[PDB]
Every structure is written in structure tokens, then in C-alpha cells.
Design a protein around this ligand. Structure first.
Ligand SMILES: CCCCCC/C=C\CCCCCCCCCC(=O)O[C@H](COC(=O)CCCCCCCCCCCCCCC)COP(=O)(O)OC[C@@H](O)CO
Ligand SMILES: CCCCCCCCCCCCCCCCCC(=O)O[C@@H](COC(=O)CCCCCCCCCCCCCCC)COP(=O)(O)OCCN
Ligand SMILES: CC(C)CCC[C@@H](C)[C@H]1CC[C@H]2[C@@H]3CC=C4C[C@@H](OC(=O)CCC(=O)O)CC[C@]4(C)[C@H]3CC[C@]12C
Ligand SMILES: CC(C)CCC[C@@H](C)[C@H]1CC[C@H]2[C@@H]3CC=C4C[C@@H](OC(=O)CCC(=O)O)CC[C@]4(C)[C@H]3CC[C@]12C
Ligand SMILES: CC(C)CCC[C@@H](C)[C@H]1CC[C@H]2[C@@H]3CC=C4C[C@@H](OC(=O)CCC(=O)O)CC[C@]4(C)[C@H]3CC[C@]12C
Ligand SMILES: CC(=O)N[C@@H]1[C@@H](O)[C@H](O)[C@@H](CO)O[C@H]1O
Ligand SMILES: *[C@@H]1O[C@H](CO)[C@@H](O)[C@H](O)[C@H]1NC(C)=O
Lengths: 151, 233, 288, 291, 243
């Protein structure tokens, strides 16, 4: 319950949450994925995730049909799942101190389950109605690490 | 032979996509196609032996079948497999038209004398070619415009205008390419071409087919002058 | 000229000329430099052949004279542009605009009529008069719908944008996703949700070209848009813009009647005309 | 003319027409959040219609008979349709479930219930006349449909044989190889199709980050014969066919651009004109001026 | 006829109070009316009032002129949006009145009106079929997640939206994209086990059958009845010189 603020102060590791990706703790990432350079890299990854999340939030805010596109989904869940998905992708590590957990991969599916249909630009490639956010390719067997169900 | 062609077409169409992992130039489908081509060659040889070359060629359907046989014999060449010649592989299904005499009679009646429709199609092709060339020579040099940078693209654009799909988008892009001083004349030219294509040419097709369905006037006059229920149980 | 073989060679030469004019293109030479010379050879060689006829015709011909003159002009322009003194991207290519028309010569044999040309001329004249009448009908309806659009639908230029957008800073990032119109009225049209507000991008300084030509700002543009909609191409999007930008009933009535009248019946008038022409061909000729 | 109009059908028939109009108007207000099963206000029309339909059937069956009579209530397709509609409505009334799982028997029952307006066709003689005139040319329409089906089968077989699995491209244009497009990339978002604004040099188009995937286009593909047939049927309408043309040309080479074009010539320009000619010829035949 | 055409062209700019250009135009619209009044007065003072009344075209012209005179009287008193819209409507009707003046255009107009009158029953049949399909569509797809083409405009959430979308499909614009939007299945959409109104997933086979049948039946068959009606009526009425 101590969000990492100073790179030097930090260095049980199981109680120091990250700034942006608060769902994860430094201990697991150390386990699966000198300490000053590591913590600095962690902060850089968090900064990049913050930037991309802000970009996505700005894009979504302009979607005027935000509360009508689905009767079973709301924008807050879409934002939460996007944040978790990005954090998991930068932090491809199994979480151990979860209380309830699911594979991290399915998180992207849930995105396209709850997030609105964003139409991609067709200027140099004809997408033919292809959704911006999809996971499974042509005849690709989708299903690994497990991590907290932050839903 | 009808059942055999039906089975051949069904097998050919059954070559659905399975996976990128396994796929080879030689497969059960290729062997089946070679076998069917051999059968067609045997049939053609027997037919020519019996009826003679002159008798065999004397009728249009036999010429068509011979042409298909040659096409599918070239098709099975391993370097030419799955090439354009695959068209000749599917054209075999045309033979099935002979299963029902009613279908053949309907085809002959509705298409009528081939001269009219042949003239119409050649006229359409010639008009499309000339207009595509004209617009190419008008627009090929225009910078920032790719729709007319080559003759094939100009023909694609004109065919699109004929179909009426996205025609307004092509017109808008052309007006964007040219300066505002020249936009009006090019817009007028495109509008006139679209008007001519949509209102007359398609109407010409409709009228041609309608007249094909229409009976001959002499036959009309001749025929006109000449001229147990559910409870049965 | 005497032998029919000469006519056959002339027809094949006309086909080759059409192919050559189709091939001549700056990017064709750029991607395939060698063909730049090939097009030259035919362009001159074929010309020479036709010159003979011009020499032999001294003892309708204005058509052949104009075509051969166009051939001369095209060869001359080719000579200058191969010397590299005139840019290949120059507009001078327009001088080849009438050359492909030579294609008609290929069918001239079929165009020749020895039967009583008077009747065919009468049929074509009657068809021309009927086509003219239906054209006036269409133009009158288009003008009517154009003036109605000018009066009813104003101009489609109001759009929702981010609250803090400033003039001259208009850009992709300033528009809502998807771009949605308004009516400034508090009760009519669409209202920007909170945090956005809509106004005229024309006032911000955007040019007409970048906003698109479609609209009802003037009678000319109004009839242009009416014809575009009457083609059944993009009329639904225009209708949606109208609903978002103006009262719902106005757009529904206008577009429903426009589709009812112009799209179906008026178009069918032309098919009716051609059917009557085919009937007259059926009787007048008595055989075909 | 008013007297003739009022005498077009029997008084019972007029009452039935009015009742059907009331019922369809009442059904027009049904919505997923205003279901009839839970809205008593909409029940009245259904109840009145069913009661009146029941009495009509009761009166007619004892007057004409259901079978083996010179005149019967059910002797043509109209009687079959009316009996079917009444039985569906009565079953709906008797059951009227409170929970309707998606794609279940109850949903099918509601779909059948939706066929209610067709009664006007049988009840009004002019609608019967126009239906008969339309169906007169059923054989010719069927033959034309078989011809189009054969052409579509030819082209679908060719497409499945040649293009199977070749239309798939990774969603990221930058990468060219399947194995090399993994992770995340930045995809732009459509703003306005009609707009053609220029972009300032120091700005990036709106967009967000999405994963790289090797996926086929959603609207069409040629993986199997069924998908090819569906794609060709879509191309018959002349809507969205330019996207198919561009996709084929860019992803399978420009030569295969012939394949689509010829189809549009054979299927769209001619094929539908066969339907047009058949319908016009049948109309003239029925009018009686064909000979 | 030329004066009527000029008055119609006067409507080239939207009449609105804010724009000053509106005020002059109205003025030039007044004088024409007075001139037109003479054309009526003449025709009603050259002929007996009954004689003028017998011709229906004269009745229409008199009604239009009276309405225009009323608009002139109102304009000098109120000078509001109502007056401008009334004047625009009067000018529109006067321009539409040109049809009787010409011969060929008149005959074509009679063809069109007779065609719609005789196709009334076919149009009612189309409307009934469209209503049936609208009921089916609202039942099957009343709650579908918004997609490529389903949006605020294209929706099946109510009967009216279904009618509008079906009419669009009859016009054919992007029907296939709507169908594929209705094709959405998991994991794109959230399925429900109990009720269809609590789920956003579409019906695959239902969508295929629905849209294919609707498009084929309406577009390929029924409109050709209107085509035939137009053809027969145009042959009936339109007729140039006969040898
Ligand atoms: C009559 C024939 C007229 C001419 C036909 C040319 C056929 C030869 C095709 C070879 C093309 C060579 C250039 C390859 C290329 O790179 O050009 C491509 C397009 O060419 C293409 O397919 C062009 C696609 C061919 C379209 C012509 C189809 C003819 C069939 C119509 C017959 C109707 C009767 C690029 O197009 P995009 O930028 O993606 O848009
Ligand atoms: C599929 C539709 C089947 C149509 C049956 C064939 C036409 C027919 O026989 O209809 C009869 C009965 O009319 C009907 O009931 C038709 C009802 C069909 C409603 C659904 C039609 C859908 C619209 C056309 C489909 C395309 C008309 O007979 P009649 O005029 O002589 O009337 C008195 C009986 N002798
Ligand atoms: C017999 C009649 C009725 C039909 C006439 C058809 C010709 C006008 C067509 C047939 C083949 C066409 C050619 C086919 C292929 C090409 C390749 C094409 O190559 C490129 O465009 C490459 C450009 C690049 O990629 O940079 C240039 C046009 C050209 C010569 C085409 C020009 C027009 C041709 C000769
Ligand atoms: C074919 C028949 C049925 C009639 C169709 C009308 C066309 C004959 C003409 C008449 C009005 C014309 C339009 C009148 C006005 C304009 C505005 C013009 O835009 C500008 O004036 C901006 C100039 C600039 O920004 O520099 C572009 C051409 C356009 C669309 C013209 C295109 C051709 C139109 C539609
Ligand atoms: C006299 C002639 C015209 C015969 C017409 C008979 C129809 C009225 C039949 C044919 C199809 C039948 C339906 C077929 C299937 C079902 C599914 C069935 O669904 C279930 O509830 C069972 C499964 C479950 O409950 O989980 C209920 C009856 C119903 C609506 C049937 C009701 C009666 C229908 C509409
Ligand atoms: C709901 C919302 O965000 N409304 C905004 C407000 O936040 C902002 O401060 C203001 C400009 O000062 O524009 C408006
Ligand atoms: C997004 O737009 C930029 C130009 O602003 C372009 O370079 C980029 O390729 C586009 N995105 C994709 C996925 O092509």
C-alpha cells in the first residue's frame, strides 16, 4: 500500500504498488520479468502506459454515443479493462498474491466485448469493417500466465 | 456423365481452406482433377472416333466441349495449376443445363437471337474503351490524381461510374485534383457521361431483353387467328 | 483501296491505333521506358498508311481528314516530347483527345446502311425529340427540388467541436468522433453533449473545398446535390445530416418524395421510351 | 362511389379489417423495453382480435366446412395462412412466457406472430388480384433464379479454389510478414468521410494503440464455398463491390482484378435485367395485350 | 411563362430576415404578383366569370393569384418569417403551375400521376410487407450493439426506426454492412441465457434469412410492377405525331 515514488528509497517488496499499474507489485515482476536501473525502467514503462492511456481516454471521450452503444456495457468498464490490458502487456508476469485471478490474455477479448466499435481509417488499406480492437486472427487458437481479475 | 460432372464440380468446390501448416502442389484434389481430365480426354477421343472430326465439330455444343477439354488439359500442367485456366475447370457445370429441356428452351427463348445482344455488348465495350482513353488523355498528366495515372485505372474508374458505386467520390476526387477554374467543365463532362450510361445503356439492355421475351409479330397473328377437385376422394 | 483486304488492314490499323492511344501515358513510360519507343514506331508507321488514302482520295471524308490531321498532330507532339524539350507531364497531351475516336472506323462497315435510310433517320429524330422532352421534365423537377432544398435545408456547415477550440486551430483533433452536425436552436436538431459545443466552421476560416461541395447554399449547388441524391448515391448520409441539422419532418418529407418521384418513375420513363422505340423497330422495318 | 366502396366486402369483413388495423397499430408500439407480455395497455388489442377471430372461425366453419365441401373456409393458401396465424396467436396467448431466451421457441413464436398484417391481402380483393398477378410468373422467376445461382456457383467455386486464405493481411500496414507483426501499434480513427482537411506538419491524426493481428476482412472472405457465395451475392447488389475489388487487387495481385469485373458485367448488368424482362413480360401477358 | 420562370428563379437565395438581401427580393416578388393579377383580371374580364371558371387551369391560376395577393397584403403589415415562408410557398406553387402551359410536360405529368394512382395498391402491399419485416426486425434485433453501420440513425430499437432502416435497405444503401453488423456474435457481444431484451448479441441465421429475403423480394420483383405501370401509362398518354 505504498505507491513507489522515489527510485532510491525503495532500494517486503510485496507491499509496494506501482504508480500507474497499481494492480501489480514489484515483487512478481522481479520474480518473472542494479535495482536503481530496474526501478527506473519500471517508471519509464509506467510513464509510457500513462501516455497511451491518456491518448485512448481522449479518443473515447469524443465518442458521443458513449452511453447508447450497448445496454450491457459502460465506458468505465472499457477504460478499466484497457488499463489492465496495457499494464499486463508491459508486465507479462503471473501474479501470486491475487484473491481471484484469470488469464491475462482474455483481458483483450473482454475489451472487444465491452468497448465500443471504433471505426479505423481506410486510406492506405481497406479494412472492410474490421474493428479497431480485435484479438483472434484467421483460424488462430487463442487458448498461460494468470493475474488478478480487476473487473 | 451428368452425375460425373456434378461430382467433379462438388469435389473442386470442396477444396476449402484448412490451414497454412500443410499445403502442397500435389494433393488428392489434384489427382482427382487429373483423373477427371483423363476421363474427358477419353470421352472426346471416343466421340471424335465415332462421329468423325467433321461431324463432331458440326455442332456448337461439341465445339464448346472440345474447347473445355483442351482448356482443362492445359490446366492440369503442374506449373499452370490454379492459374487462370481454372475458369475452364468450373465451366464444366454448364453441361448441367442439358439436364432439363425446359431450362434449355427458356434460355434459348429469353436470350433470343444472339445478334442483338452481341451487338449491344460490343457497343458497350467499345464505348467504355473510347471514353476511358479520352479521359485518360485528359487527366493522365494531372498531379495528385491516381485514378487516371494509367489506362487500367481509368477503365476501372469508368466501370465504377457505370455501376454507380462511389461515383460521387470519384467525381469529388477529380474536382479536388483539378483547379477550381476547371472543375465546372470536368464536372459537366462526368455528369453527362453518367447520365448517358445510366439512363440509356441500361434501358437499352432492358428493352433488348424485353423484346427477346416478346413473341414474333407473325407468330402472334398466326396463334391469335388460330385461337375433379379436393372432394374427388 | 480497291481490294477488301485494304479495308481489313485499315480496320486492324484502327484497332492498333486505339491500343496505342490507350498505352500512351507518362507513368507507362516511367515504369516501362522501352515502350516509349514502341509507341513511336506504330504512331508514325500507321500514319504513313493513312497518308496514302489522303493522296488516293483526290480522285463524310472530312471525318477521315480530321482523324489523319489528329494523327499528324500527335506524331509531331511525340517528336517534341521525345526530344526532352517539353516536359512529359505537360498538358499538351490534350492534343491526343480526339485520336481514340478512330475506333468508330472499325465498325464503319456495320454502320453503312443501304436500306431506306429515311425511316431510320425518322426513328432517330423521334427518339431525340422524346429524349429532349423527358430531359426537360427531369430538369424542371430537379430545379423544383433544388429551390425547395435552398429554402428548407439552409447550409450544412454547423458541427460539434471541443469546447476550447479556437479559430485557425481547426484540425482533426478538434472534431467529435464521428463528426456530427447541429441546429443552433435549443429545441430543434442535435445538441452537443456536455463539454462540446457546435458552431460554423466556415466562420473559423475553413474553405469550401475542404468542407465538401455538397450542400444547399445556392441554387446551383442545391440542384447539384438533388441530382446526386436522385442517383441513390449517398442520399442516406445527406438525410442523416439534414435530420441532425434541421427538423425531422422536413428531411423525411423532402427525401421520401425525392426518392419516390425522381429515382423510380422518371428513370422508368426512359425505359418506356426505349421500349416504344423497339416496338417501332419491330413494325417499321418488318424484319430483323 | 361511396355506396360501392361500402359494399366491397361483407360487414363482418369490414369489422375484421378495422380490428386488424387496430391490432397492427397496437403492435407498432411494442419495444424491447415495452414488451406486450408485461404491458397490460397493449393486451386489449390482442385480446379483442383473438376473440373476434375465434368467433369468425366458429361462424365460418359451421357454415362452409374445413374440408370436402363445394365451398370451404380452407381451400387455398389464404385459408392456410389465416388458420396458421390464428393458431400461432392462440398459442402465444395460452403460453405468453415471462422469460424469452435468445434464439428459442418463444422468439420464433413472436416472429410468426409478426406475420399478422398479411390478412389484409386476403381480405381486400385488389390485394388478392395483385398477388395472383405477381405469382403468375413464378416459373420464369424460378428459372432466372436457377441461372443466377449457377453463375454464382461458378464464380464462388473459382474464388474458393484460387483465393482461399490469400486475402488475410495483418492489420498493421507497415509490417509485411505475418510473424513480424506482433505486440502493439498505433491505429488512427475515422473522423469524417466527407471532410478532406489538410494536416499540419507537426500534428498526428487522432488514434489509439491496438494489437497486431493477421485477420481477414469482416464483411467478406473466400475461406469456404458458403462465404464465397455470400460475397458474390453481396456484390450482386452493386453496393460495397468497390471495396471487394480493391481488396482483391491489392492482396491477391492485379491480374485477378479481371475475376470480379467480369462477374459484375455478367451478374449485375445482365442478370437483374433478366428479372426485369421476365416481370414486365408477365405483366403484359396478364394484362392481355401480349398477343 | 418567362415571367413565372423568372419569379421562380428569384427563389435562388434562402429567404431569411437576418440577411439584408432577403428584403429587396421580396419587393421584386410583389411587382410580379401585380403583373400576374392583370393576367388573371384580363382573363376574367375578357371572358364571362363563368367562362373563366369552367377551365380548371384558370381556377388554379385564380386561387394562386388570390393567395399571392393575400401574401402581399400581409407582408406590408407583419413583415415576419411567416410572411416570407408564405411568399416562398406561393412562388413555388406558381412555378409548379407552368406544367399546364406546356404540352409534352403536361402529358408526362398526367402519366406520372396516373401511374402512382394505379400503383397505389402495389405500394400498399409494399408497405404491408415492410411493416411485417419491421416487426420481425424489432423482435430479433431490437437490442444490437452499435457497429460499423448501426448508429443513432440506423437502429431497430423501435418500430419507426425499423421502418426507416427497411426503406433505406429498399433503396439499397449499405444494406450488407447493416447485415454484418447484425451478425455480431461472441466474443464481440455479451450473451444472455434468459432474456433476449437483456442481451446485445444478434441472430446469425435469422439475420441472413431476414435481410436476404427482404432485399430479394422488394428490390428484384415488386418495383418492376411500378416500372410496368409507368411504361404502360407513358405509352397510353404520351404520343407525338403519328404517320
Ligand atoms: C477490355 C480490357 C481493358 C484492359 C484490361 C487490362 C487487363 C490487364 C491487367 C494488368 C494490369 C497491369 C497493371 C498492374 C497494376 O499495378 O495496376 C493496378 C490496377 O490494374 C488492374 O488491376 C486493372 C484491372 C483490369 C480491369 C479491366 C477489366 C476488363 C474486363 C471488362 C470487360 C467488360 C466487357 C493498380 O491498381 P490500384 O492502384 O490498386 O487501384
Ligand atoms: C408465397 C405466397 C403464396 C401465394 C399463393 C399463390 C397465389 C394465390 O393463389 O393467392 C390466392 C389467395 O390469395 C391469398 O390469400 C394470398 C395471401 C399471401 C400473403 C403473402 C404474400 C406475400 C407477398 C408476395 C410474396 C412474394 C388468390 O386466389 P383468388 O384471387 O382467386 O381469391 C379467391 C380464391 N380463389
Ligand atoms: C481489342 C480491344 C477491343 C481492346 C483494347 C485493349 C487495350 C487498350 C489494352 C489491353 C492490354 C492493355 C495493357 C495491359 C497492361 C499495361 C501495363 C500497365 O503497366 C502499368 O500501368 C505499371 C505502372 C506502375 O506500376 O508504375 C500500363 C498499361 C498497359 C500497357 C495496358 C494498356 C492498354 C492495353 C494494351
Ligand atoms: C445535368 C443536368 C441534370 C443539370 C445539372 C446542373 C449542371 C448543368 C450545373 C448547373 C449548376 C452547376 C454547379 C454550380 C455551382 C458550382 C459551384 C462551384 O463552386 C464554387 O463556386 C467555388 C469556387 C472556388 O471556391 O474557387 C463548383 C461547380 C458547381 C458545383 C457547378 C457544377 C455543375 C452544375 C451542377
Ligand atoms: C394448420 C397448419 C397451417 C399448421 C400450422 C402449425 C403451426 C401453427 C405450427 C408449426 C410450427 C409450430 C411451432 C414450432 C415450434 C415451437 C417451439 C416450442 O418451443 C418450446 O417452448 C419448446 C422448447 C422449450 O420450451 O425449451 C413451442 C411451440 C412452437 C412455438 C410451435 C407452435 C405451433 C407452430 C407455429
Ligand atoms: C463538462 C465540462 O467539462 N465542461 C467544460 C468545463 O469543464 C470547462 O472548464 C469549460 C471551459 O472553461 O468548458 C466547459
Ligand atoms: C495514421 O496517419 C498517419 C499520418 O497522419 C500515417 O502516417 C499513418 O500510417 C496512419 N496510420 C496507419 C495505421 O496507417
Amino acid at each position: 500500500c505504498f505507491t513507489v515514488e522515489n527510485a532510491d528509497a525503495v532500494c517486503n517488496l510485496s507491499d509496494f504498488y506501482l504508480s500507474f499499474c497499481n494492480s501489480y507489485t514489484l515483487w512478481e515482476l522481479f520474480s518473472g520479468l542494479t535495482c536503481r536501473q530496474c526501478v527506473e525502467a519500471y517508471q519509464d514503462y509506467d510513464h509510457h502506459a500513462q501516455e497511451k492511456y491518456e491518448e485512448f481516454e481522449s479518443v473515447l471521450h469524443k465518442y458521443l454515443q458513449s452511453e447508447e452503444y450497448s445496454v450491457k456495457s459502460c465506458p468505465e468498464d472499457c477504460k478499466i479493462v484497457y488499463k489492465a490490458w496495457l499494464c499486463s502487456q508491459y508486465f507479462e508476469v503471473t501474479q501470486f498474491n491475487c484473491r481471484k485471478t484469470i488469464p491475462c490474455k482474455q483481458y483483450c477479448l473482454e475489451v472487444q466485448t465491452r468497448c465500443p466499435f471504433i471505426l479505423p481509417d481506410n486510406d492506405e488499406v481497406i479494412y472492410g469493417g474490421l474493428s479497431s480492437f480485435i484479438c483472434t486472427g484467421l483460424y488462430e487458437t487463442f487458448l498461460e500466465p494468470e493475474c488478478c481479475d480487476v473487473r | 456423365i451428368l452425375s460425373m460432372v456434378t461430382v467433379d464440380v462438388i469435389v473442386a468446390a470442396s477444396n476449402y481452406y484448412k490451414g497454412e501448416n500443410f499445403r502442397r502442389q500435389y494433393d488428392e484434389f489434384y489427382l482427382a482433377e487429373v483423373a477427371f481430365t483423363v476421363l474427358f480426354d477419353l470421352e472426346a477421343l471416343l466421340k471424335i472416333w465415332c462421329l468423325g472430326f467433321t461431324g463432331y465439330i458440326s455442332s456448337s455444343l461439341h465445339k464448346f466441349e472440345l474447347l473445355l477439354v483442351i482448356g482443362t488439359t492445359l490446366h492440369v500442367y503442374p506449373d499452370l495449376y490454379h492459374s487462370q485456366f481454372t475458369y475452364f475447370q468450373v465451366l464444366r457445370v454448364v453441361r448441367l443445363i442439358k439436364i432439363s429441356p425446359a431450362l434449355e428452351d427458356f434460355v434459348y427463348k429469353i436470350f433470343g437471337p444472339g445478334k442483338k445482344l452481341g451487338s449491344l455488348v460490343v457497343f458497350t465495350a467499345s464505348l467504355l474503351i473510347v471514353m476511358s482513353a479520352i479521359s485518360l488523355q485528359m487527366f493522365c498528366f494531372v498531379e495528385e490524381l491516381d485514378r487516371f495515372t494509367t489506362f487500367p485505372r481509368a477503365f476501372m474508374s469508368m466501370f465504377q461510374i457505370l455501376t454507380q458505386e462511389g461515383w460521387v467520390d470519384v467525381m469529388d476526387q477529380t474536382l479536388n485534383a483539378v483547379g477550381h477554374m476547371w472543375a465546372p467543365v470536368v464536372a459537366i463532362y462526368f455528369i453527362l457521361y453518367h447520365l448517358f450510361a445510366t439512363l440509356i445503356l441500361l434501358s437499352l439492355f432492358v428493352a433488348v431483353i424485353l423484346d427477346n421475351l416478346e413473341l414474333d409479330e407473325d407468330l402472334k397473328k398466326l396463334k391469335q387467328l388460330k385461337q375433379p377437385l379436393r372432394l374427388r376422394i | 483501296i480497291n481490294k477488301p483486304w485494304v479495308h481489313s488492314l485499315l480496320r486492324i490499323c484502327a484497332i492498333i491505333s486505339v491500343i496505342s492511344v490507350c498505352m500512351n501515358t507518362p507513368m507507362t513510360f516511367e515504369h516501362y521506358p522501352p515502350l516509349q519507343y514502341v509507341t513511336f514506331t506504330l504512331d508514325t508507321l500507321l500514319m504513313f498508311l493513312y497518308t496514302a488514302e489522303m493522296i488516293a482520295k483526290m480522285h463524310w471524308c472530312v471525318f477521315d481528314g480530321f482523324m489523319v490531321f489528329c494523327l499528324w498532330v500527335s506524331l509531331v507532339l511525340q517528336v517534341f516530347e521525345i526530344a526532352d524539350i517539353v516536359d512529359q507531364m505537360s498538358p499538351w497531351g490534350m492534343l491526343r483527345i480526339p485520336r481514340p475516336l478512330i475506333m468508330i472506323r472499325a465498325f464503319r462497315i456495320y454502320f453503312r446502311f443501304e436500306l431506306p435510310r429515311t425511316r431510320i433517320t425518322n426513328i432517330l429524330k423521334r427518339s431525340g425529340e422524346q429524349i429532349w422532352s423527358v430531359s426537360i421534365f427531369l430538369l424542371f423537377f430537379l430545379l423544383l427540388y433544388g429551390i425547395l432544398g435552398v429554402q428548407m435545408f439552409g447550409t450544412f456547415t454547423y458541427h460539434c467541436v471541443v469546447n476550447d477550440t479556437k479559430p485557425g486551430n481547426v484540425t482533426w483533433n478538434s472534431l467529435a468522433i464521428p463528426d456530427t452536425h447541429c441546429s443552433p436552436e435549443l429545441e430543434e436538431g442535435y445538441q452537443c453533449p456536455p463539454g462540446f459545443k457546435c458552431m460554423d466552421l466556415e466562420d473559423l476560416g475553413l474553405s469550401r473545398q475542404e468542407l465538401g461541395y455538397s450542400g444547399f447554399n445556392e441554387i446551383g449547388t442545391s440542384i447539384f446535390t438533388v441530382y446526386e441524391a436522385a442517383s441513390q448515391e449517398g442520399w442516406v448520409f445527406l438525410m442523416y445530416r439534414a435530420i441532425d441539422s434541421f427538423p425531422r419532418w422536413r428531411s423525411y418529407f423532402y427525401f421520401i418524395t425525392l426518392i419516390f418521384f425522381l429515382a423510380w418513375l422518371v428513370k422508368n420513363v426512359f425505359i418506356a421510351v426505349i421500349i416504344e422505340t423497339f416496338a417501332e423497330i419491330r413494325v417499321q422495318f418488318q424484319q430483323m | 362511389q361511396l355506396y360501392d366502396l361500402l359494399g366491397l366486402v361483407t360487414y363482418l369483413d369490414w369489422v375484421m379489417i378495422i380490428v386488424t388495423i387496430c391490432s397492427c397499430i397496437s403492435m407498432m408500439f411494442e419495444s424491447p423495453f415495452r414488451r406486450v407480455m408485461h404491458a397490460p395497455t397493449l393486451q386489449i388489442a390482442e385480446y379483442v382480435f383473438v376473440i373476434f377471430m375465434s368467433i369468425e372461425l366458429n361462424l365460418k366453419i359451421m357454415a362452409d366446412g374445413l374440408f370436402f365441401t363445394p365451398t370451404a373456409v380452407i381451400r387455398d393458401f389464404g385459408g392456410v395462412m389465416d388458420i396458421f396465424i390464428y393458431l400461432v396467436s392462440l398459442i402465444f396467448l395460452c403460453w405468453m412466457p415471462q422469460n424469452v431466451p435468445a434464439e428459442s421457441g418463444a422468439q420464433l413464436l413472436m416472429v410468426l406472430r409478426c406475420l399478422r398484417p398479411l390478412r389484409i391481402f386476403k381480405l381486400v380483393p385488389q390485394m388478392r388480384k395483385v398477388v395472383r398477378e405477381l405469382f403468375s410468373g413464378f416459373k420464369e422467376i424460378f428459372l432466372v433464379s436457377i441461372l443466377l445461382l449457377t453463375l454464382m456457383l461458378v464464380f464462388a467455386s473459382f474464388g474458393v479454389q484460387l483465393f482461399a486464405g490469400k486475402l488475410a493481411k495483418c492489420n498493421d500496414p507497415n509490417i509485411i510478414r505475418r510473424e513480424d507483426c506482433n505486440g502493439i501499434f498505433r491505429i488512427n480513427v475515422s473522423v469524417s468521410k466527407n471532410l478532406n482537411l489538410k494536416l499540419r506538419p507537426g500534428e498526428k491524426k487522432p488514434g489509439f494503440w491496438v494489437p497486431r493481428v493477421w485477420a481477414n476482412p469482416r464483411n467478406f472472405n473466400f475461406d469456404n464455398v458458403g462465404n464465397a457465395m455470400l460475397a458474390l451475392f453481396e456484390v450482386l447488389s452493386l453496393k460495397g463491390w468497390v471495396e471487394v475489388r480493391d481488396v482483391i487487387i491489392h492482396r491477391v495481385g492485379p491480374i485477378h482484378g479481371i475475376y470480379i469485373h467480369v462477374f459484375v458485367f455478367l451478374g449485375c448488368m445482365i442478370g437483374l435485367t433478366l428479372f426485369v424482362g421476365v416481370v414486365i413480360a408477365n405483366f403484359n401477358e396478364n394484362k392481355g395485350t401480349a398477343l | 411563362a418567362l415571367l413565372v420562370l423568372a419569379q421562380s428563379v428569384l427563389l435562388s437565395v434562402k429567404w431569411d430576415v437576418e440577411d439584408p438581401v432577403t428584403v429587396p427580393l421580396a419587393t421584386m416578388s410583389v411587382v410580379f404578383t401585380f403583373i400576374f393579377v392583370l393576367e388573371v383580371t384580363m382573363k376574367i374580364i375578357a371572358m364571362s366569370p363563368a367562362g373563366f371558371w369552367q377551365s380548371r387551369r384558370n381556377r388554379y391560376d385564380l386561387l394562386v393569384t388570390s393567395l399571392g395577393v393575400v401574401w402581399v397584403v400581409l407582408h406590408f403589415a407583419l413583415l415576419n418569417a411567416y410572411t416570407y415562408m408564405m411568399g416562398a410557398c406561393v412562388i413555388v406553387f406558381r412555378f409548379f403551375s407552368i406544367c399546364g402551359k406546356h404540352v409534352t410536360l403536361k402529358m408526362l405529368l398526367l402519366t406520372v400521376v396516373v401511374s402512382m394512382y394505379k400503383s397505389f395498391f402495389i405500394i400498399v402491399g409494399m408497405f404491408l410487407l415492410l411493416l411485417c419485416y419491421a416487426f420481425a426486425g424489432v423482435v430479433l434485433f431490437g437490442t444490437v450493439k452499435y457497429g460499423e453501420n448501426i448508429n443513432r440513425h440506423a437502429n431497430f430499437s423501435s418500430a419507426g426506426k425499423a421502418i426507416t432502416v427497411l426503406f433505406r435497405i429498399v433503396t439499397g444503401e449499405d444494406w450488407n454492412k447493416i447485415m454484418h453488423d447484425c451478425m455480431v456474435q461472441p466474443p464481440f457481444c455479451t450473451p444472455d441465457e434468459f432474456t433476449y431484451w437483456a442481451t446485445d448479441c444478434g441472430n446469425y441465421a435469422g439475420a441472413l434469412m431476414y435481410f436476404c429475403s427482404f432485399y430479394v423480394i422488394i428490390a428484384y420483383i415488386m418495383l418492376n410492377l411500378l416500372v410496368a405501370i409507368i411504361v404502360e401509362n407513358f405509352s397510353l398518354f404520351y404520343s407525338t405525331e403519328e404517320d
